[model samples]
Target chain A: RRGALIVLEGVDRAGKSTQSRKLVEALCAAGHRAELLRFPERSTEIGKLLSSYLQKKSDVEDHSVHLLFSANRWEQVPLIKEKLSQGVTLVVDRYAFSGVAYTGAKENFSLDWCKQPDVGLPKPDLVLFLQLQLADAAKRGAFGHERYENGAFQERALRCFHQLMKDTTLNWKMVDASKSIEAVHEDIRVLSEDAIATATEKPLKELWK
Target chain B: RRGALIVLEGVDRAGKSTQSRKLVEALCAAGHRAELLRFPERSTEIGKLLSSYLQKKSDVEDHSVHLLFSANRWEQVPLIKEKLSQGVTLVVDRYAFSGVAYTGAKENFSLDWCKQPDVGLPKPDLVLFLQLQLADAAKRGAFGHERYENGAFQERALRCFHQLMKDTTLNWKMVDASKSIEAVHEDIRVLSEDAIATATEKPLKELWK
Candidate 1:
């Protein structure tokens, strides 16, 4: 039986990374085979290219950067597919959803254009969209000096994220990221548990139909 | 008025490079500002990465390689647009047409998917498709030891190129590569001359509309 591919997507400081780690830990502690992974994987050649761009060590055109990010995810597809088929539940920190939202939020970039490179990636069994207002996100921590850490851009990215949710047919659940860390993880764990069971019986779906 | 953007596309052993150089030389000798460029440009960081993959110094997944090729083209868009607007004709050796054709020729890839990353790239004013049989191409030169230098794959790429021509609204002209170089250049020169005059009167078109 194949395991579920669960993705966590949301604005920065929304605890996607923390929750993904915790979810995997919780799943493993419960004796389920689980793993946590993040995009811009930072290990492969493509990932290193993306890392340099993201970390401001290098400059790339907006279009090229978007494609590089897509390539990074694509480079990981084989590993993701193999582990899932091996019955290991995967908790992805970010997936194509973030790739679309972040790039689409930029000027001269459209949601449709951003969605193209990742059209047929492996679909998520459940996308846990951590919802948090910008105010609360700021309270958690000030925005870093990264490329996409600005308040205005984050707001736009959130709007694009909502648009993406409306545009896709994937199973999506809104988790209250404004809640306590433990509370958010509780919701994610239950949702993941249910998805893991359902995914085993249902065949894997391709993204964007 | 902007200058014409002419592209030459064909199988690897076809005379795209030799003809591209000759075309540019002919354009410049005739007193028209012109330049020659090729894909997998091998200059920029993205190009360097692609060069490694093409030279078989590194291995990349098929989908990632396709996106990289697309990104390589996208990276050149700015320079191409700048030159064209300055009334300098661009005689490109190969373009996105070849990108889609070569990658889509591989198993498990589709022309539709391959066209995504390059959806909005600047369109060529005229695409000169050099048509030559595999037997004739073999006589020109034996296929090299590069990743895409096999006979069977070249045949598939040729088929995909035809499909791409039929699929797009861009101006496509098939030149007989089996003919002598001078005879082929005579045809290309006339076609390119016509396109240069016509493109000046028309606003640039976007690929795939």
Candidate 2:
């Protein structure tokens, strides 16, 4: 049986990372083999480039930074697939959906333009979108120095995320991220279990057009 | 004035790498600032994983590898744009076209899907496709131990390359790579000069959707 590809996605302060860790732990406690992977994985060479871009230590052109981010995902693709094929559940902090949403938020580039490079890559089994308002995120903390860390940008990204979900066929569950962290985690855990069962019962589905 | 973004692409052994190098040199000799960048850039961490997959040392699932390839490009996109803005010409060995052609050849995934992750990436000013007969490429040298290094795959990729070209507005030239290296290089050099002149005459164009 193949492992499930489960993804948790949301704005920066939505606690996606926190919930992702808990969910992976829950899956393992249930006797399923599971692992967690993050996008813009800061460890690899391409990831290091991405980190530089994010940290503003180095200023990369917008399109170049976007491609590097996608490259970071490609580097880990094989490992993600191997774990899934080996019947190990995988939880991604952010996946292609984030790629689309974040890049698409750029005004000059349309959604279609933002989506081109990622066309043939792997599709996630289930994409959990943790929905939160900019106001909610603002209350969580101040914005970082990253490129897209502004209130206006976050608002635009929220709109893009809605469009992104409308464009794909991956099983998606939207959780209210405005709630407390523990409550959000509980909701995610329930949805994740359901997604896992679905993946076990069916073959993997591709994510995009 | 911004410089042109030039891409040299085709199936494996279509002389893309060789032509890319020569074109950059010719541009410099002609008093232009030019540089060449290769795809699946094994120099980066993401590229290392892709390199492993290509060498068959690592077994990455199809989808994962595809995304990594796109990510690798994203990482470099900013630099490519910066050079152009600084009036330095770029002669890329492969770009989005390779992403489209190689993944489109796979058949299981849609071309549009393969294109999604690459949306919003920097659009090249011109794409030079070195068209070649499969037999000619097989005759050039011994095949490498890479994943997509075969005559049959190259043939299918040729068809995909044609279709992918229709999606871009950048000037595209198909050179007959079956000719001697000198002849092909001459053709590429002439075309590149023309492309640079044309692009220089116009404002920079946005990447395709």
Candidate 3:
């Protein structure tokens, strides 16, 4: 049987990476092979440009930035699919939702516009949205020195995420990220188990409409 | 007024690049500023990878190759838009449609699937699809080296292009490449004038649906 593709998505500092790691570890311990993948993966040439864009070391216009983020996902798509075919449960730190949310936050580019390049890419089995209020996220630490890592942008992005969620077809679970790390992990654990059961039993569905 | 986004699209050796160059020169000669952009540009890091893939010096999984090609576009999107905004006509050798046609022709990925990531992207003001039969394209020496460069793939891609034309809302024109080089340039020249007039008169429409 093909493995499941699970995506963990949230704004920056929502602890998606940590949760993705823990979830993959738990899946492996439960005798299911698992792997963790991150978008804007920072390993490939495009990724390096994405990393530079995120860090503000290089300046890219909004449309360019949005497309690069989408391209980042495109670069990793084959591996994501291959792992699923190999029966390895894949945990992704980010996916198309991030592409939608981040780019949708921009002014001239609407949510629908930001979603163009990603129209028919692989769909994830489950998308775990790490929901957090702007205030809660800002309290965690100083915002990273990246382009979209700021109070104003994060606030706008939160609204975009809500709209994005309503538009997608993936199985979604919004975990409140205001709690302690342990609490968040516990929530993810339960969600991960449910996702594994559902995905392992059914045929894969593309995450987008 | 913002200049129009003009896209040149077609199967390999359909004279898109050559026509793109001629269009840029002609546009400039007419006192309209213009620039030419190509897909899998083969200059940037991701482009280099795509070039290597085409040269068969390296192999990439299908999805990865497609994404790299898309990423090449992302890297140039801002420049294209900026040039247009500055009243410079932008002549793109290929845009989202090439991304759609080439990647959509792959086995596991459907045309709809290939188009997923590109949703909500900026739409070109005009798309001139350089049309030629497979036999005509095969006569060009540059037609067969990379993946998706054969008669079979080209046939599938041509079908996909037709489908895109039917589905897309952009100002689209089909140019016959069965004409001589000078004749093809003349057709594109006339089309460019009409496209520029439309662009100058209307607001920019979003590229991806």
Candidate 4:
């Protein structure tokens, strides 16, 4: 049997990594097979290109950066297929949604255009989209000097996030980030476990298909 | 000096291949650096994947095959850039226009969807659209046994081709392909000459930029 394709999405400082790690550790500790993955993956050639664009180390044209992000996800398709085949559950920290929401936040970038590159990629079994107030997420810490980490852009990005979610029909759940860390994980863990229990049996589906 | 990015678009049996080669040969004979190009290149890895979809050797989902078509074009960006940089005038038989029109026809909507992928991959300086009557072109030769060669699909495809044309900002001229091949070639010649003479002076532009 294959494994679950679970995804976590939220603005930075929303504890995506912290909660993701907790779930993975708990799942494994409970005698289940689980792992963590991140996007703008930062290891592959395309990822490095995205990193440079994100870190402001280089200037990438809007369309070029957009396609590179999609390319980064595409290179992972084989690995995703292989891992799932081995019954290895994958907990992705971010995936195509973040790519679309963040870039679509930028002026002159079409949300529809942003969505096309990854249209047929493996759909996540569960998408846990954390909804946190900008003020609250901002109070968590200083913004990193990345392209999309600033206050102005973050507002538009969240707007984009909501817009993208409304147009999409995926296995998505909007969890309140205002909850305690323990409370949030409690919601996500069960959804993750439920997906792990049932998703693989459905025959993996595609995004935007 | 750079070179003009010229394109030939038409339905099946409308003579894209015949006219593209004629244009390329005539340009070279006239002492201009010229060449021919096509999309769904079918040589690169992604291209081969697209080929399987086209040949029905692999039963790929519509969304996946659509993205694969886009990916195949993407893999050629560097080659297109390099050749164009070397003052090579490219007479592309078919490009993103065909991708958008054909698939959009099959889907029967989302004409906007197919145009997104290749938006920034070089735009054509002159698009010579070979307009023809399907009844006329159909009588000229045999149709390939492939995914979208039926009469009904071709009718929808031509409609999508016209609809997609209105959505784009590229320079386009519709030549009557119902005329004699020699007459069509002559009409294409003067326009090709004009593009070759003037396009380089303007530098290259992107599809929707």
Candidate 4 docking class: incorrect
Report the C-alpha lDDT of model 2 over B94-169, residue by residue, as the tens digit.
Answer: 8877887887888686776777767667777788888877787888888887898887787888888888878646
Native contacts recovered, in order, as a fraction for each?
0.72, 0.41, 0.35, 0.15
For model 1 the local lDDT of residue B52 reads 89
TM-scores of chain A, one for each prediction:
0.97, 0.95, 0.94, 0.96
Better of 1 and 2 by lDDT: 1
Off by over 4 Å in 4: A1-6, A10-94, A101-113, A116-187, A190-209
Q: Residues A85-139, candidate 1, lDDT per residue (tens digit)?
A: 9999999999999999999889989888899889889999999999998899999
For TM-score, the strongest prediction is 1
DockQ values, each candidate = 0.82, 0.32, 0.35, 0.15
Show where candidate 2 strays beyond 4 Å: A1-7, A21-61, A64-92, A115-153, A165-204, B1-6, B17-92, B107-109, B116-127, B144-147, B162-170
The lDDT-based order of candidates, best leading, equals: 1, 4, 2, 3
The list of candidate 1 runs beyond 4 A from truth reads: none
Residue-by-residue lDDT tens digits, candidate 4, B1-209: 88888999988888888898898999999999999888768875556666776787876546446656666666677777788889999998888888888878875347666677877678889988899998988898767877887788889889988887785578899999988878889999889999988977987877765
Model 4 chain B lowest lDDT segment of ten: B59-68
Ranking by DockQ: 1, 3, 2, 4
Tens digits of lDDT, candidate 3, A86-125? 8888888888888888777777667766776676677777
Candidate 2 docking band: acceptable
